[PDB]
Amino acid sequence: GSSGSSGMAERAALEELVKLQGERVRGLKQQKASAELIEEEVAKLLKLKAQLGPDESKQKFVLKTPKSGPSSG
């Protein structure tokens, strides 16, 4: 959920969540599921990747809420 520090196995299991979330999202877009679930599962796909630390695909500097710390459970 939010656990470990520089565990390789923990990163593999996290990357599994990223993969499976991203595959499920791809499926949902295909499956004509609720668009309202899709964007929520896509926001979870964003949140999780934003814990891994994604590649710098051009600069952004989009601001955020004041240290919101959106965990889950």
UniProtKB/Swiss-Prot annotation:
It comes from the Eukaryota. It is found in: Cytoplasm. The modification N-acetylalanine is found at residue 9. Brain, heart, liver and kidney. Residues 10-66 form the WHEP-TRS domain. It is linked to Usher syndrome 3B: A syndrome characterized by progressive vision and hearing loss during early childhood. Some patients have the so-called 'Charles Bonnet syndrome,' involving decreased visual acuity and vivid visual hallucinations. USH is a genetically heterogeneous condition characterized by the association of retinitis pigmentosa with sensorineural deafness. Age at onset and differences in auditory and vestibular function distinguish Usher syndrome type 1 (USH1), Usher syndrome type 2 (USH2) and Usher syndrome type 3 (USH3). Charcot-Marie-Tooth disease, axonal, type 2W: An autosomal dominant, axonal form of Charcot-Marie-Tooth disease, a disorder of the peripheral nervous system, characterized by progressive weakness and atrophy, initially of the peroneal muscles and later of the distal muscles of the arms. Charcot-Marie-Tooth disease is classified in two main groups on the basis of electrophysiologic properties and histopathology: primary peripheral demyelinating neuropathies (designated CMT1 when they are dominantly inherited) and primary peripheral axonal neuropathies (CMT2). Catalyzes the ATP-dependent ligation of histidine to the 3'-end of its cognate tRNA, via the formation of an aminoacyl-adenylate intermediate (His-AMP). Plays a role in axon guidance. Belongs to the class-II aminoacyl-tRNA synthetase family. Homodimer. This is Histidine--tRNA ligase, cytoplasmic.
